[PDB]
């Protein structure tokens, strides 16, 4: 099978920059190369066909070039909505193989997270388990640390964090850290808190609550 090697595997660029994604074919495919855009949770969208011909409704900023074994996709002026994984595909030889893809992330101004804390619900507590959630909303860069404390004691191995995909409008990330404890462990302590460290914050930020308030 013909291998389609994309370079780089991922990249970051500011809004308005010229982005260049290259695709290398293991053998000559002339101009039988298509480019696709796959946004998270969405089906791939056709961008370019015949190596250089732009599909209907595709913005002017997207353009393809190249023949034989070397192909390039160019975004003349990167937009916040252009956050996606881009795939090259050879389509004139079976089994019409696709490249690994290139994740395009957007570089933007540093944005501090708005931090929120949530106590376990009364409905959950009757199930013998307790979840304490710490939300870090709309921040840049992606790097952030969330430490948990119960009765002023640092927690380990009982928390899971989840990060959203880069926002298509403001290019920010969101994070949630879930502290899971048994109803017994939750009922034997009072102070619950999460400490947030991020580049956009001069000093760490704390959000907390006292069980039974």
């Amino acid at each position: 099978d013909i291998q389609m090697t994309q370079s780089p595997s991922s990249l970051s660029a500011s809004v308005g920059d010229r982005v260049t994604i290259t695709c290398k074919a293991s053998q000559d495919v002339s101009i039988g190369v298509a480019w696709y855009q796959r946004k998270p949770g969405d089906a791939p969208k056709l961008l370019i066909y015949s190596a250089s011909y732009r599909y209907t409704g595709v913005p002017s900023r997207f353009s393809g070039s190249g023949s034989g074994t070397d192909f390039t996709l160019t975004i003349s002026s990167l937009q916040p909505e252009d956050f996606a994984t881009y795939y090259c595909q050879q389509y004139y030889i079976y089994p019409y193989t696709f490249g690994q893809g290139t994740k395009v992330e957007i570089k933007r101004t540093v944005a501090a997270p708005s931090v929120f804390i949530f106590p376990p619900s009364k409905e959950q507590l009757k199930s013998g388990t307790a979840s304490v959630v710490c939300l870090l909303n709309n921040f840049y860069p992606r790097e952030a640390k969330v430490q948990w404390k119960v009765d002023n004691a640092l927690q380990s191995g009982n928390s899971q964090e989840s990060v959203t995909e880069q926002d298509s409008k403001d290019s920010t990330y969101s994070l949630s850290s879930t502290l899971t404890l048994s109803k017994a462990d939750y009922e034997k302590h009072k102070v619950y808190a999460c400490e947030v460290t991020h580049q956009g914050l001069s000093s760490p930020v704390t959000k907390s609550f006292n069980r039974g308030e």
Partner: protein
């Protein structure tokens, strides 16, 4: 309006069989070649097979030959993908796609159906509210311990969309998934407006409308 509606996806035990179907509409069905393409995180995109709706003739990728059978029903504008002897490696989102002539580039793609190959059982989620004890306030929903993926979350029956952050699902030690859906709203609306999150996990048919009260 061209639309490719997929069905038949879901949880299947290893060694099991699944039949995916794709209902095509908004174009002359017999005028274009129909395909199935698969996507898996880390694995990328893979062309599965193609069928000519006019003749009924199908071509398969050598990895899926014998194991998958691609048929068509012109009277129903539907193509069928019979997938036999499914393994964990077959877990992917399967896309129905359209192409024209000897050029196998796809202009139209379906929504995609997730196929989960696992020995684990279907479990519906427990839905709990996320409410607090300045100008902007945050409220959410905890969708805990469900299998398989996916889950959909909406707020106020789809009226509230701005500031909504539905976090990707995290696989827990138990082999069960869990996620949170949050929303940032003005603080003054907490006492005058009702906030309800609507959770839907189609595999277990669990449809919950949880009211979030601060």
């Amino acid at each position: 309006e061209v639309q490719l509606v997929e069905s038949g996806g879901g949880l299947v035990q290893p060694g099991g069989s699944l039949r995916l179907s794709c209902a095509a509409s908004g174009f002359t069905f017999t005028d274009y070649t129909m395909d199935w393409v698969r996507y898996a995180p880390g694995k990328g995109l893979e062309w599965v097979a193609d069928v000519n709706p006019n003749s009924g003739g199908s071509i398969y990728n050598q990895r899926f030959k014998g194991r998958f059978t691609l048929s068509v029903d012109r009277s129903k504008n539907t193509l069928y993908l019979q997938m036999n002897s499914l393994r964990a490696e077959d877990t992917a989102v399967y896309y129905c796609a359209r192409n024209l002539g000897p050029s196998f580039y796809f202009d139209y793609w379906g929504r995609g159906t997730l196929v989960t190959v696992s020995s684990a059982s279907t479990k519906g989620p427990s839905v709990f509210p996320l409410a607090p004890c300045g100008g902007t306030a945050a409220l959410g929903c905890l969708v805990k311990d469900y299998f398989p993926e996916p889950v959909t979350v909406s707020w106020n029956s789809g009226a509230l969309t701005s500031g909504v952050h539905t976090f990707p699902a995290v696989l827990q030690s138990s082999g069960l998934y869990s996620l949170s859906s949050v929303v940032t709203v003005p603080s003054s609306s907490l006492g005058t407006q009702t906030y309800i999150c609507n959770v839907n996990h189609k595999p277990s048919n669990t449809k919950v409308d949880k009211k979030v009260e601060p």
